[PDB]
Design a protein around this ligand. Sequence first.
Ligand SMILES: [Mg+2]
Ligand SMILES: [Mg+2]
Ligand SMILES: [Mg+2]
Ligand SMILES: [Mg+2]
Ligand SMILES: [Mg+2]
Ligand SMILES: [Mg+2]
Ligand SMILES: [Mg+2]
Ligand SMILES: [Mg+2]
Ligand SMILES: [Mg+2]
Ligand SMILES: [Mg+2]
Ligand SMILES: [Zn+2]
Lengths: 136, 116, 49, 128, 96, 122, 23, 86, 72, 99
Amino acid sequence: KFSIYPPIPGEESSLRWAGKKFEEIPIAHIKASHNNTQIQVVSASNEPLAFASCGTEGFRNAKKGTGIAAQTAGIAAAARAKQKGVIHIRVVVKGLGPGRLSAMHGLIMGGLEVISITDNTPIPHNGCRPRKARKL
Amino acid sequence: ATPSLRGRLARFGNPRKPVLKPNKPLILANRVGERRREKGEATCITEMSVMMACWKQNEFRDDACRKEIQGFLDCAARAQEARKMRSIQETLGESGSLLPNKLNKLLQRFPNKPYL
Amino acid sequence: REVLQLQEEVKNFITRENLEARVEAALDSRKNYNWAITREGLVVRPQRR
Amino acid sequence: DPPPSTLLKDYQNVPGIEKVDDVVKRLLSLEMANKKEMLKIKQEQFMKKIVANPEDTRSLEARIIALSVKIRSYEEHLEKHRKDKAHKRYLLMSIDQRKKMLKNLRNTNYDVFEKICWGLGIEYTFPP
Amino acid sequence: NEDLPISMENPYKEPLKKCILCGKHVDYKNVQLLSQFVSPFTGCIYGRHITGLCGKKQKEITKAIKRAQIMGFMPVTYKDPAYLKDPKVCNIRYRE
Amino acid sequence: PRYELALILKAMQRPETAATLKRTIEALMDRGAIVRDLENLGERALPYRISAHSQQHNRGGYFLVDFYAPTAAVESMVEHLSRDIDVIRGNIVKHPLTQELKECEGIVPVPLAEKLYSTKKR
Amino acid sequence: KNVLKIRRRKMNHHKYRKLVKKT
Amino acid sequence: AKHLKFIARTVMVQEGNVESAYRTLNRILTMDGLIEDIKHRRYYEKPCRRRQRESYERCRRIYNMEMARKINFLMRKNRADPWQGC
Amino acid sequence: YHEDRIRAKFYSVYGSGQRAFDLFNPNFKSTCQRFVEKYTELQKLGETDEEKLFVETGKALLAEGVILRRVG
Amino acid sequence: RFMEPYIFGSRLDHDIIDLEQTATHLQLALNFTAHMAYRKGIILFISRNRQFSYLIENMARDCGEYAHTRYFRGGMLTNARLLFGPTVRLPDLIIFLHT
RNA sequence: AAAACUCCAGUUGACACAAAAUAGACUACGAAAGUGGCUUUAACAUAUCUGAACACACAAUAGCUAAGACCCAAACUGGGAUUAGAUACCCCACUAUGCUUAGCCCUAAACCUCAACAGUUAAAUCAACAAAACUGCUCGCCAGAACACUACGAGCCACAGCUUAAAACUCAAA
Ligand SMILES: [Mg+2]
Ligand SMILES: [Mg+2]
Ligand SMILES: [Mg+2]
Ligand SMILES: [Mg+2]
Ligand SMILES: [Mg+2]
Ligand SMILES: [Mg+2]
Ligand SMILES: [Mg+2]
Ligand SMILES: [Mg+2]
Ligand SMILES: [Mg+2]
Ligand SMILES: [Mg+2]
Ligand SMILES: [Zn+2]
């Protein structure tokens, strides 16, 4: 029982959460970089609901790419989502960095429930040419 | 399964470009390298974060956020005792892997003879 | 033998008068080129569902 | 230039030709085939017209005919595709090999040498 | 005298192991066979030691996979969800 | 030689797809290509949102056309297919039955490739 | 280790390039 | 962005088990070779250095496999002292 | 030898005998040795087909007093 | 490498030692060891083998000979003038059970 | 840490003239350089060997002209931090360039530094490393060094160059 694969939208989708299926669940995109992260909760109908990041609190310079700042941003985003009624979210991780799971922990501790951990890292398939290798 | 090593090194009987270009000669030794340990952890931060948040929300008194501060103290004590038991166990106990001492002893018991 | 087989096979082709019936038979028929295998080497076709 | 429909080598010495219809004749021709078939047909025609017995494949005349066919193919590929250095080098090497074989043939047998020179039309020039 | 050994064709020789797709035909139109050799999560092609085929077999497999992905017969970055309940052949270790 | 064609259309069930198949057969017969048979794979689902001519398509079918085209009309057929509007995409690929299945004996454990370094005590 | 001659040749080439750039 | 949505790299949570699912996703990414690929493509790598690093990784993997096979072969004699003294 | 090929065929058809191999007795005659002896004494007569020889050897083994455990 | 004329053949990756020339070399070996003890000689059994270290030491003890199945020190048989005493009669025959 | 932009950042619908993850635990093609997203076409020589600096044809990338696009990377440039000084190691935006067409001297650690054609190791056995050591034929080079990838001379679609290549002086050397 309990298949790790996501349910297909096709035939009968037998998983219910608060009277809703899976395609009608709001999304919580997280763009975690090497020094800053942003958390925005968007509904299923593509409508912005909440937006909280490290720069919208009090952290400056390299203090944004920390675990405490990411956790506070996640807690603030979860509170702003609960103020309007979201409950269930779908975390989307974009990029690597120190604050990759701190935002998820903050969103969970804020009062939200996570049922699917997704990530769409934009890894280029020999795409654009990055910058030159710096000399440490 | 180990891959092939026929046409890899640049030899006299290989009329092609060398695939593998090692810096050291491919001769196995009779010693096991020391494993890595004691890295950067920096754990137990959510308790401190929520304690600072509770202190910033209300007043800076001690009787206002007793639950958060006692949870932080308990988490710190648990982390300390976990580090202590880790340092104690990682000196005589082996789980999954083995001790490099016995490994190099067994390698010296059956050494390699590449010089024939 | 090969040219006799080719002559026997060329009897069923598409020219100018066999177009409407051929496209109707093609639209009224389906083909499945999907077939799975196992660890022992046996061919298992998903047409038995 | 051989005709587009002239039955290649693989479908030449086979019984039953007049009984064949039109679709099989058009499929088994040079239209839906490969250029290698046309090259082999040209080589066979040259070996049947110029030299006598075409069964001797390891002979020098067959090698000369094959090198001439390869030279013609390389010249066609060069006049069709301008920037092509590898094919141009291969053409030059084939010309040099054909000239060396013609020199050797003239040194060992002048009769077949002049016969090939009259047939293919090429003339062995003395190197300065 | 007659008890001397004779160098024959070396008996006690077990037949060489074949392959799981040696007596078959590899085509780009087959989506099930081309999807059974890809990861169901990231859509990554497994290595040679994971599948267990020869050189030409794996080459034809990956060529058919790439042709189906380019022409439009199988997803690239993921796997078709209708081809998940199939007998697993490749050796995996995740999920557990 | 022999070739195939993976024709991809939109969603029209019968009339428009029949008309496109008729046009394709007429073009093949005019360009000197003997049509052999036709295989229908059925109306399936596209693996990704295609962006072909103008509109975005997400529900199309598949068709297979077998014919013997010469080595001088492939570019003309590709141009005719790209000029069409109802046709999403279609690459001319040779028939797979031309290349026969090569025999094989399987894999073999390669021994330890020695004879690479000198035999000195060092 | 074994690059002294190469460095001397590089210095000579640099001096030659500087002399060419001068006049 | 022309493909489907929540299908690629998608896991589930069983009764709030969010850390186990995250560890499983991390293990899947490390097995498929994506985190290391992103760390490599973070900076532009020259083809010479690319070939050198690939050869280094291949030789190190071969040496590690040989050492692991040797250890697995020699572990059959990891006993005590059957012959005291002698 | 040829008895090696006979034992190879026996192991390919049947397999391992029910009796345990005793490497201490020099004159230890196992099932494979009896099969080889029967095949030799049947070839000494005058038969060429291997299937008839195998059937006759199996019949001789069943008649001498042993149970042939074959994998069908 | 120096084991080609002393092996008959291979039986399933197993070298079979031929007993034809083995008995010839054994007769010359027993003849050389018999005249050693017959002419008042010292026989030393050196065999570094922990599996059969007890049986060899008892055979040389009951026969009045000498054995050495323990650790062999460096300059023992060579530098015998600084490891024992002034002068030591070196054994004129040493048998190796395990080379 | 600056500094840079606040027509900035975030999910979504509409978009390329360079590069082509996973197949890369494969050793493949090509004389070498070089070449792994898909489809079609033409095609990868020589039934003795060697053989040019008295010749011919190719040859990584870097530089030019005559026609265009230009996300990104980046010679130069200007600004911003430290150092007594920093024209550089850190960051920001951009040019020449990486792209398509045609023409130029043909430049390398062109390094697998091992010339090509064949073979061998219980006859032959190497100062030392590296990739263990030799038999037959043939082309170019060497015999101290810096001087000197140097002037001149000889040839060049090149006018800061390429191919060939010294003399004068010093030392007991490298
Ligand atoms: Mg090195
Ligand atoms: Mg391009
Ligand atoms: Mg030559
Ligand atoms: Mg530009
Ligand atoms: Mg830019
Ligand atoms: Mg160039
Ligand atoms: Mg190179
Ligand atoms: Mg060189
Ligand atoms: Mg040469
Ligand atoms: Mg030159
Ligand atoms: Zn096979």
